[PDB]
């Protein structure tokens, strides 16, 4: 219904739509048989042998094209049948494009965009440009000239080089001045590209394996897109390119990417063009449209036709959507234009078409082609107008299956790629050498490509202009505004001479990239680690895979990132009934070795990446995980991009004296214009991020897929080397199809790949989030700062004019500029895969910290990557059980200084922010501590800033700026008390602030004290956060501190609550002080249901029993403290039974022995379980005389569910069934200790304190009672 006739090549000439036609040519060309498939659109099913007069032969060029894949068939398209296939093929493809809403649009657009008139050396007059026509030869011999938009030719020598070619002029650049000219697309539906995807495994799990073929519809659309631009005369000059660095060993030898092509592809490639450049173009073509309007206006005469000047004028009014007034004066509506231009450049995109054809397609021009296939789309049993290759109701409608070249293998014949495997390369060596193929190298854009005016001041007026992403919804809205008839006519025109004279539009000029290119290097590079993995490749019987390369220098040059365990397991040595055998087992090993997994931003880590590609960074051996936690994703990147946001250009507002309305309109215009700003700066960052960072990650991603392939093949080889030596004989006895084997491992490889995708997904985002975005957010937060000043000085100054609404306006300005607008990636990316990784990364309040101080692999560091430097004092003490626990002494050299990065901190950052840390504060002991306040965390520059301090039973938060003027919150707690929740126990502090509100202080996630800070400030952002005991007048004093954090926002009740449980480690049991409960460490036992008793044994042996007696004493120091004695009673030791866990920390659900210390002899806690009744009376038995008595306890810190709990010890019989939790019986006599199943029942239904709630108290200098 787009192409109304079914043509057969052999159909005879008629001179209307089947005719021999001449074409614009350098000198004489004899004519060719063309078919006019649609009004304005012609097809010449003939190898383009005539448009470029300097391509004589269809033979491969003597020095080859720098193009990853290329194909040469000088016989192709030489017979009739071939042509007739061609004709039908292109036809069908048009119908395929036309069938989609977007295709209907692009296609109409084309037909409609008539090449301008044009030529006329005289102002007043219009003339047609001769090269924009053809001569159509009738049967009888006369010829008639025809106007023409679009010709499809068969291809030139390089068969797959599909181009858009025009004819030129001496003066005019017809494709870049709004004029347009006739497009000649070299094309073929008889071949298509083979590429590899490795991203669709996270949605379609059982996906192909090898290559997938590009749908020829997409390509044809692609070329039409280019045709479109050029017909409207809006193609970007191709001297305008995206220039790459090229000197580094890893950088891509060379590569031309034309801005035009970027825009054209669409999607995320298009996003490499910064805004300042996108606008330049648009303004430029708008102007080039204006000039057309005005030429129109000047024209008073028309030549070379029987048509009407006005008819023709109106042809163009319609093309360029010009606006006509009453007089006939034309002009360009900025608004109307803006849209057309958006549709030609932002809606007609390869990417959008792929949303429409719903096929699998490459995702960035950067996904290099890999091979070439011959296809035949004309038979319906092969490929239909609606489904393309992925035929509905078959095997192929599934996971882009139609497009898998393996799966649909009767539909793609593989071909010779004429570009050799190392036609273009660089040579990388060591102080051995390899060729690495140019196209396997890293793309590294020049900084030159990224411009902006972020630095430009702006004057806000009341006038000032307020703007006002590409969804399928939106396109619909475009489609519907489309008017889909009144198709520009075919009109009769005065004949042009028999031979139209014209040269093709002369391109650059682009030079031959220098060809490897020697590089002598110090490490093995990741290209080298990658060649090791290849072979070989290869018959007799090599393949003995081995780690520690030199592998290279063989074969069996075949390195693997696997363990001896596997390298040993395949370098035997096995027949023959044991092969069957072998195999299975090697499907398991592979799937454990490759499905391997393992911080809070990079949840999922792939350990074996380091060893695969020697990442990279590549100091060894492979504890890659460690290094990745330490430094960030930044270890993956091969080059580290520069993030260069300049000081944002400030606003300044126009005052409109004695006028209310224009003064408020200027404020509102100001505020909104700000909002644009954050978008402006963000977007830029995304653009920078996409091009220099995400690209490197996508290549490693490509490279990890490739190793996994290498490994699979190396295995396959070695299973087949063996198999081949055999029966065989039988041989015809153990039938075994490597298609099943290949079958399994690709499934397998796929399963690993969803992991690695995830992993590197988190990598890219996290990089953007914590080392790109921030450098920008500072600059914004500053621009914000100064606009506020500027706006409030505006209100004060115009205050009489504003009389009635000043407050209403200070509140406006003060709320909008105090809020940190939210980075939404969804606003800058279209991509489901990333958007959902980012959605996952925000969900977690800690990835958003600006300071996050963890001990990792032997250094205290900042996992948030803000902190510039961390100086650790000479006598800072790390707790060797849990190094995150820092001890600070009242030495001036027990101090940790954190110094933040300069261009990341901004003055107004402690105005809405928060801090958390766990502290452990020893009992105050001495009179001088009664009145002595001492700083411990200091953030103050010259009297201004914030600080945390301590005093006798107090934690103190203090704010102060800039010359006044403190506020202050307090947690207060007593030392005269039996058992303290707080004295010398780990407590979790959280401080929140809000410039227009109050400092709040929270203890273990309970709000304590709050006070108004709105009086101020403002505050002075200190570069320095110093952890030190400053001013403590207790020589012997010290504190413990851990997990320090800093947040650029005010944490709410539910956030801090969460924060509270995430850092609690609910899985590990804890002693009374809050430390990790450890095995083989004497504890004094405290029963919480009766805390005024301790434990005792009346008698050792089974005649005896344990019991609670009282009282506990007191401890005291006259005036300072008087608490319950804590080191009393008989001692418990948790002795390991089974574990693993190399270590000493008693975890939830650990099964243990409990020993009881009686008079410095260790005894074992046990009971007779068949003692009639529910409560079993526990005793202390001679460790060896226990026998078959019940003595195994489950250590607990949760239940079930996972409600935490203080019932610690569930006791079990030597069969594994519960007996009871250990507690105490009594209202009857004498509080003996029992295992009571009633507890286990009770905990399910309540969390109340019970007779089984124990706490384990170790001796600690911080409590300091004497035993």
């Amino acid at each position: 219904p787009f192409v109304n006739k079914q043509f057969n090549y052999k159909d005879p000439v008629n001179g209307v739509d089947i005719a021999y036609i001449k074409i614009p040519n350098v000198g004489q060309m004899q004519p060719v048989k063309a078919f006019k498939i649609h009004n304005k659109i012609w097809v010449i099913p003939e190898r383009d042998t005539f448009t470029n007069p300097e391509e004589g032969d269809l033979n491969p060029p003597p020095e080859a094209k720098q193009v990853p894949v290329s194909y040469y068939d000088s016989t192709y398209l030489s017979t009739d049948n071939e042509k007739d296939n061609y004709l039908k093929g292109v036809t069908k493809l048009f119908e395929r494009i036309y069938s989609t809403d977007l295709g209907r649009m692009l296609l109409t657009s084309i037909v409609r965009g008539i090449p301008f008139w044009g030529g006329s050396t005289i102002d007043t007059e219009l003339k047609v440009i001769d090269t924009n026509c053809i001569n159509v030869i009738q049967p009888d011999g006369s010829y008639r000239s025809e106007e023409l938009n679009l010709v499809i030719i068969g291809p030139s020598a390089d068969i797959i080089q599909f181009e858009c070619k025009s004819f030129g002029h001496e003066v005019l650049n017809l494709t870049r001045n709004g004029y347009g000219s006739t497009q000649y697309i070299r094309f073929s539906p008889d071949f298509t590209f083979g590429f590899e995807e490795s991203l669709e495994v996270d949605t379609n799990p059982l996906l192909g394996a090898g290559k997938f073929a590009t749908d020829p519809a997409v390509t044809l659309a692609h070329e039409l897109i280019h045709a479109g631009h050029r017909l409207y005369g809006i193609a970007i000059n191709p001297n305008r390119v995206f220039k790459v660095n090229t000197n580094a060993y890893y950088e891509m030898s060379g590569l031309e990417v034309s801005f035009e092509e970027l825009r054209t592809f669409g999607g995320h490639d298009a996003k490499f063009i910064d805004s300042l450049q996108e606008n330049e173009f648009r303004l430029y073509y708008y102007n080039k449209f204006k000039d057309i309007a005005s030429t129109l206006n000047k024209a008073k005469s028309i030549v070379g036709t029987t048509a009407s000047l006005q008819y023709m004028k109106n042809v163009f009014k319609e093309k360029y959507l010009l606006s006509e007034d009453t007089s006939g004066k034309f002009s360009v509506d900025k608004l109307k234009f803006d849209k057309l231009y958006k549709m030609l450049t932002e809606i007609y995109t390869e990417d959008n078409f792929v949303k429409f054809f719903k096929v699998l397609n490459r995702k960035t021009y950067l996904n290099f082609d890999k091979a070439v296939f011959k296809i035949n789309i004309v038979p319906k049993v092969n490929y239909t107008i609606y489904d393309g290759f992925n035929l509905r109701n078959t095997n192929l409608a599934a996971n882009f299956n139609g497009q898998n070249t393996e799966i649909n293998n009767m539909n793609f014949t593989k071909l010779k790629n004429f570009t050799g495997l190392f036609e273009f390369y660089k040579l990388l060596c060591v102080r051995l050498c390899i060729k690495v193929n140019n196209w396997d190298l890293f793309f590294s854009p020049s900084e030159d490509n990224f411009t902006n005016d972020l630095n430009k001041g702006e004057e806000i007026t009341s006038d000032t202009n307020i703007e006002a992403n590409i969804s399928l919804d939106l396109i619909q809205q475009y489609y519907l505004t489309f008017n889909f008839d009144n198709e520009p006519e075919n009109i009769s025109i005065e004949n042009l001479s028999s031979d139209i004279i014209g040269q093709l539009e002369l391109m650059p000029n682009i030079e031959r990239f220098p060809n490897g290119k020697k590089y002598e290097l110090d490490k093995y590079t990741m290209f080298h680690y990658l060649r090791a993995q290849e072979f070989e490749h290869g018959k007799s019987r090599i393949a003995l895979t081995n780690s520690v390369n030199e592998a290279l220098l063989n074969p069996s040059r075949v390195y693997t990132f696997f363990s001896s365990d596997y390298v040993k397991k395949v370098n035997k040595a096995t027949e023959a009934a044991m092969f069957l055998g072998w195999v299975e087992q090697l499907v398991y090993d592979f799937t454990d070795e490759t499905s391997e997994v393992s911080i809070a931003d990079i949840t999922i880590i792939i350990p074996y990446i380091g060893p695969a590609l020697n990442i990279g960074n590549m100091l060894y051996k492979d504890d890659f995980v460690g290094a990745l936690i330490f430094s960030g994703a930044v270890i993956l990147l091969e080059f580290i991009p520069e993030i260069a946001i300049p000081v944002l250009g400030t606003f300044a507002l126009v005052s409109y004296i004695a006028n209310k309305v224009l003064t408020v309109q200027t404020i509102d215009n100001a505020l909104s214009k700000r909002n644009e700003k954050w978008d402006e700066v963000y977007k830029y960052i995304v653009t920078n991020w996409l091009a220099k960072v995400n690209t490197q990650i996508d290549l490693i991603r490509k490279k990890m897929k490739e190793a996994l392939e290498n490994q699979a093949e190396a295995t396959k080889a070695i299973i087949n080397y063996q198999y081949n030596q055999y029966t065989e004989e039988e041989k015809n006895n153990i039938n075994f199809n490597i298609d099943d084997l290949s079958s399994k491992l690709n499934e397998s490889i796929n399963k690993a790949m969803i992991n690695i995708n995830k992993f590197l997904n988190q990598c890219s985002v996290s990089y953007l989030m914590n080392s790109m975005i921030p450098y920008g957010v500072k600059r914004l937060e500053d621009f914000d700062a100064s606009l506020k000043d500027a706006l409030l000085k505006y209100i004060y100054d115009n205050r009489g004019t504003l009389i009635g609404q000043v407050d209403r306006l200070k509140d406006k300005v003060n709320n909008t500029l105090s809020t940190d607008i939210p980075f939404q990636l969804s606003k800058y990316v279209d991509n489901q895969r990333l958007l959902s990784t980012f959605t996952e990364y925000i969900k977690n309040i800690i990835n958003t910290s600006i300071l996050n101080l963890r001990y990792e692999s032997n250094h205290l560091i900042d996992l948030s990557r803000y902190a510039s430097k961390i100086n650790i004092g000479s006598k800072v003490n790390f707790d060797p059980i849990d190094k995150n626990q820092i001890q600070l002494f009242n030495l001036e050299s027990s101090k940790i200084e954190v110094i933040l990065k300069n261009a990341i901190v901004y003055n107004s950052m402690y105005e809405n922010f928060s801090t958390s840390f766990w502290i452990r504060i020893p009992k105050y002991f001495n009179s001088i501590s009664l009145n002595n306040e001492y700083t411990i965390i200091n953030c103050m520059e010259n009297n201004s800033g914030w600080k945390v301090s301590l005093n006798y039973g107090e934690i103190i938060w203090t704010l102060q700026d800039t010359q006044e003027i403190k506020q202050r919150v307090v947690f207060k707690y007593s030392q005269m008390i039996n058992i303290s929740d707080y004295i010398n126990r780990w407590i979790f502090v959280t401080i929140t602030n809000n410039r227009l509100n109050n400092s709040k202080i929270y203890i273990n996630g309970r709000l304590i004290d709050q006070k108004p800070i709105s009086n101020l400030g403002n505050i002075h952002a200190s570069n320095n956060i110093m952890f030190k005991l400053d001013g403590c007048r207790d020589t012997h004093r010290y504190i413990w501190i851990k997990y320090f954090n800093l947040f650029d926002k005010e944490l709410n009740e539910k956030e801090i609550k969460d924060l509270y449980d995430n850092q609690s480690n609910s899985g590990i049991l804890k002693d009374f002080w809050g430390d990790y409960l450890q095995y083989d460490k004497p504890y004094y036992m405290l029963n919480l249901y009766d805390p005024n008793k301790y434990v005792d044994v009346n008698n050792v042996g089974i005649r005896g029993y344990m019991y609670l007696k009282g009282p506990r004493g007191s401890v005291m120091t006259t005036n300072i403290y008087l608490n319950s004695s804590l080191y009393r009673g008989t001692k418990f030791i948790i002795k390991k039974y089974a574990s693993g866990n190399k270590d000493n920390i008693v975890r939830n659900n650990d099964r243990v022995y409990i020993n009881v210390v009686v008079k410095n002899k260790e005894y074992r806690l046990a009971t007779n379980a068949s003692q009639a009744g529910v409560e079993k009376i526990l005793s202390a038995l001679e460790i060896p005389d226990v026998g078959n008595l019940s003595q195994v306890v489950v250590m607990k810190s949760k239940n079930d569910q996972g409600i935490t709990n203080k019932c610690k010890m569930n006791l079990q019989d030597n069969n594994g069934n519960d007996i009871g939790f250990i507690g105490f019986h009594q209202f009857n006599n004498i509080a003996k200790l029992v295992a009571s199943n009633w507890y286990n029942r009770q905990i399910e239904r309540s969390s109340r304190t019970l007779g089984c709630s124990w706490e384990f108290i170790p001796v600690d200098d911080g409590w300091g009672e004497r035993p």
Epitope: S893, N926, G1031, R1033, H1036, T1117
Partner: antibody, heavy 117, light 112 residues
Framework: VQLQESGGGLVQPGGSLRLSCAAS????????MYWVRQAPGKGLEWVAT????????YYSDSVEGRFTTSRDNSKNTLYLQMNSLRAEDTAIYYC???????????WGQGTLVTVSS | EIVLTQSPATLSLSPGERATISCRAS??????????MQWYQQKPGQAPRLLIY???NLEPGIPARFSGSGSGTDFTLTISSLEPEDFAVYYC?????????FGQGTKVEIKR
Amino acid sequence: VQLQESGGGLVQPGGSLRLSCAASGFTFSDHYMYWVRQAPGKGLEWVATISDGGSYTYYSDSVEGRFTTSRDNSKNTLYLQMNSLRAEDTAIYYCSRYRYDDAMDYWGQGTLVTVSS
Amino acid sequence: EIVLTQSPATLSLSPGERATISCRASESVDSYGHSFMQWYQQKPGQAPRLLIYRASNLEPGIPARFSGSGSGTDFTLTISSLEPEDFAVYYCQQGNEVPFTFGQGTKVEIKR
């Protein structure tokens, strides 16, 4: 591994004097330093303690506000500034190192200070 | 001002004897599970010499005859078998809190 406290002499009532204890043989910049005095044939007396970094000082009520201690860490020196002296300031003066957190373990010979008209 | 009362006043004793010296504090001398009681031997004309730190620990290179003990407000320095060379003033010192103080000393006199 010693120290070496000099300065002293016959000084007028009302007069002022500077004592200088020099240190070597151990990382000085780490330890708290103490000043202890002993009148001629009488009890020992604690005069001043100064922290490692030199930012915190303690003085016994007796000489508070009259004496000052300070340190020049980069020179391995300790100092005792001594103003408006009284006859009760007559004593031998000993500087000492305090090994954290145990005792004053190392001591100097001690220079003599004498106040009289 | 923690007063360190030290008794006896003087203490004359023939060699190889037992030499109890009793120190005692008006206020506690204990913080962080440590008694901060030092002991000092001072022969005439020489800088005090440390003997026992934290009430109970013997200083490296000091001999066995000296031994510390006590806790809180009641410490005691014993000389397992006196010498002649252990005629000396002996001093207890609290380092628990400022103002650090010394006792007023105990003069070991030798017999014959």
